[PDB]
From a paper:
Laccases (benzenediol:oxygen oxidoreductases) are copper-containing enzymes that catalyze the oxidation of diverse compounds by molecular oxygen. The active center of laccases contains four copper ions: A blue (Cu1) mononuclear copper center (T1) and a trinuclear copper cluster (T2/T3); the latter consists of the mononuclear T2 copper ion (Cu2) and two T3 copper ions (Cu3α and Cu3β). T1 acts as a center for the reception of electrons from the reducing substrate, while the TNC serves as a binding site for the molecular oxygen and its reduction to water. Three-domain (3D) laccases are monomers consisting of three cupredoxin-type domains. two-domain (2D) laccases consist of two domains and exist as homotrimer, with the T2/T3 located at the interface of domain 2 and domain 1 of neighboring molecules, and T1 located near the surface of domain 2.
We considered that the replacement of the His165 (“gateway” of the proposed tunnel) to alanine could fix the tunnel in an open state, and the hydrophobic phenylalanine should close the tunnel. When replacing isoleucine by alanine at position 170, the T3α tunnel was expanded to 1.16 ± 0.11 Å, the H165A mutation expanded the T3β tunnel even more, to 1.36 ± 0.14Å, taking into account the estimated maximum coordinate error calculated by SFCHECK, which is sufficient for penetration of dioxygen. The His165Ala variant possessed a catalytic efficiency slightly higher than that of the wild type SgfSL: Oxygen consumption increased 1.7-fold for ABTS and 2.8-fold for K4[Fe(CN)6]. This could be explained by the increased oxygen access to the TNC upon the change of His165 to Ala. In the case of the structure of the His165Ala variant, we noted movement of dioxygen and water molecules within the TNC in molecules of the asymmetric unit. We observed the “O2 –state” with symmetrically coordinated O2 amidst the binuclear T3 copper ions in 6 molecules of laccase, oxidized “resting state” with bridging hydroxid (OH−) in 4 molecules and fully Cu reduced state without ligands between T3 copper ions in 2 molecules (not shown). However, positions of Cu2, water molecules, dioxygen, and hydroxyl ion varied within approximately 1Å, which allowed different stages of dioxygen penetration into the TNC and the hydroxyl release to be observed. The replacement of a positively charged His (at acidic pH) to non-polar Ala at the entrance to the single T3 tunnel reduces attraction of of the TNC for the negatively charged azide ions. Boosted activity and resistance to inhibitors of the His165Ala variant along with its high thermostability can be useful for industrial application of 2DLac.
Author numbering:
A (entry chain C): 41 to 315
B (entry chain B), C (entry chain A): 40 to 317
The structure:
Amino acid sequence: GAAPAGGEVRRVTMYAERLAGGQMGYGLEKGKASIPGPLIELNEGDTLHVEFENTMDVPVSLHVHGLDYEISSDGTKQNKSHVEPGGTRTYTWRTHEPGRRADGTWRAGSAGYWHYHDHVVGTEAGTGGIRNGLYGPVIVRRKGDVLPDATHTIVFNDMTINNRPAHTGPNFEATVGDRVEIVMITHGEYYHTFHMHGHRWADNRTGMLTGPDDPSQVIDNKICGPADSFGFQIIAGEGVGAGAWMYHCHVQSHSDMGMVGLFLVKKPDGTIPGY
Amino acid sequence: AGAAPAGGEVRRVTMYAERLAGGQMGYGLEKGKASIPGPLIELNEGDTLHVEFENTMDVPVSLHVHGLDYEISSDGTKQNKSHVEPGGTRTYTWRTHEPGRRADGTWRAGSAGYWHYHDHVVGTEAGTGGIRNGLYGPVIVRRKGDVLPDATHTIVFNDMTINNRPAHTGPNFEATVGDRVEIVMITHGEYYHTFHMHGHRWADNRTGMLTGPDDPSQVIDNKICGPADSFGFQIIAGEGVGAGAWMYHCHVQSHSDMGMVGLFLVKKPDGTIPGYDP
Amino acid sequence: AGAAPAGGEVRRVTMYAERLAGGQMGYGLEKGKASIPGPLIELNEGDTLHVEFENTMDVPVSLHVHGLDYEISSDGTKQNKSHVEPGGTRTYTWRTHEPGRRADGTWRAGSAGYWHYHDHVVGTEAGTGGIRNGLYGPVIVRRKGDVLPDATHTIVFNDMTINNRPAHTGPNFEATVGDRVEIVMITHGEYYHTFHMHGHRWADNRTGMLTGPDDPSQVIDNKICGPADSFGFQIIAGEGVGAGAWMYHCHVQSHSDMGMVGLFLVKKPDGTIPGYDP
Ligand SMILES: [Cu+2]
Ligand SMILES: [Cu+2]
Ligand SMILES: [Cu+2]
Ligand SMILES: [Cu+2]
Ligand SMILES: [Cu+2]
Ligand SMILES: [Cu+2]
Ligand SMILES: [Cu+2]
Ligand SMILES: [Cu+2]
Ligand SMILES: [Cu+2]
Ligand SMILES: [Cu+2]
Ligand SMILES: [Cu+2]
Ligand SMILES: [Cu+2]
């Protein structure tokens, strides 16, 4: 369970479909789009050719943060990288390992907790596409990265989580001891503060400290604005046990209005104390 | 005052929740001595703390902590039936661990940090009314070896107030040039803020100070923060700048204009503050 | 090309605050050449800078610096009798120090980094008025061995504007592929922002670049910020992504929609910009 060195040329098909009640979403199979979009994982140095079809009645696009891409895979109307209704296009994202340039300076790699979103619906910033659900997660791993038993994606989109109605979660389950991975993405108009009862993480790339020499901060509350993305890995219930562990936006009115879910950590027998 | 020692001590303490004056509420180590911010709790990594907690109010209350290990019974939440009815008592158990290598070879991150506690049931099940009335306080958790300060001041940007004070009433904080002052900065409520100090800068890491010439941590003097963010640092009062009334404030302009200002009065050894009229 | 040298030079400069067209205000090194942002001040750790200051306006003005070392008399505040009357002159001194180990064993953080200066007395004692009008400038303090860039651009999100500009006027900035471009990014006013660059990313640390494989700083391309935050980075133009009109915007959706967008214009070595067809 560690991430290998990348350098595969991988391929996938992505569709932008309309969903029930105003929503739109990406998906890897027509008829099966989802909010948030399907998780895309790659290893540093991979290349991904995304074979896109807009199946809707309005232009759409696909725009990625942090990964490498030429101006033709930008995903913006300004560059004519959008997709007409019914249209088709192939976006290419690349990645690079870190290393030294000819300069002798250090080039950082592509690894990170990133995301992809529309950039053309509603306005030329994607405002109404993001709002409708056109977003999702991409993880790019470094060699030797520790792999999880599970990855869950939490998006604070304006005043919702993953576009869901108020006080509907989502909830996620695990078993005590599971290495659980969280991808956290924020979108829209408002700043937020992500809080987890019972668990904490480092505020670096991996969410876990390099070792005793790692100056990274350890936190359980993280301010995030539109298009911030971060992620971490927590041992489920470490030092605290099983339970319905609340996670929420800690802005008080935001938590009060619905931006809450449960991290249901289970005992080996499958039962949750108090739930 | 030296360096933080290794932890491991089981500690115990009594805590109450008292209505204060002006529709406020607060936390106290003794009855009739609730404060806003609540009493400063310091453990070292390893220590356990048993808070014999009692509610002296006519409405339920709770105690919820950030950053420290605790079981679900001391969650502080109506969902986990861990609140304290009017007139009730409860023992909240917090614990802390050291950092260490896991079985799988990964680094478990310590309990140390600048943390905080607050209510979770007054007003709404997130504790909005309780946080608003003053039911919050600081928790410092040291790691073995941490430099310890000459003094410690807690600054809580609560919505549009510092420590639930009225506009433009600071609070002010005194020190003397050369002192090692530790600031604990917590934020609560609805608004983002940006915390700024005149004359003084710190490292945006755990301890607010740099490991050494290899610590890559950012050296800031302005720091955005949102509800339930908690950080702190230590500075040398007047270092490289000398004595005087050194402003701190929220750098959100309308917040500084509408009261989120205070002075960090840095005295000469003789006790006087250049340029400043008490 | 180059490297920051060690500091230690005393330097001097003239500064003028002047009214500009349309109730605006800005700073300048020469009279009549006032800009928004104000002129870029650059120093190396150790340097002292005396700034011969001229208030050409009819309204008092002040000069207030983040991050650097100054005594209360260069505080630039009404509080510390530190503002410049209409038609007044005044020398403001800024000092900077190298990082060094203190006599008490701790590490003292240096002055280096991406800082700024701004007015503190116009409109309010927070300088809310003069900051809105455009009285704010960038300050860069260099650590010895820092990589010096081919070009430096300053990007101030001032409330809902970029450099006080009208909506949807950039600024746009040009580079050639492979050029070492240093962004200075400041925020002011009332609102939080998220700064985003297409096709480019940087280290969230002091220099925006990682020092080596054991630098644990995050690699981001979207940075949240608020009034008086300042940061910076150097990127290699088009590295791994090539030439093009690379959009930089605030990613708060209503903020880019309403004009907070500009272009990073990266040219091929033949000077062309594929796709650019405004
Ligand atoms: Cu964009
Ligand atoms: Cu929120
Ligand atoms: Cu909590
Ligand atoms: Cu984006
Ligand atoms: Cu909570
Ligand atoms: Cu504020
Ligand atoms: Cu200042
Ligand atoms: Cu909390
Ligand atoms: Cu100020
Ligand atoms: Cu903005
Ligand atoms: Cu982008
Ligand atoms: Cu300032």
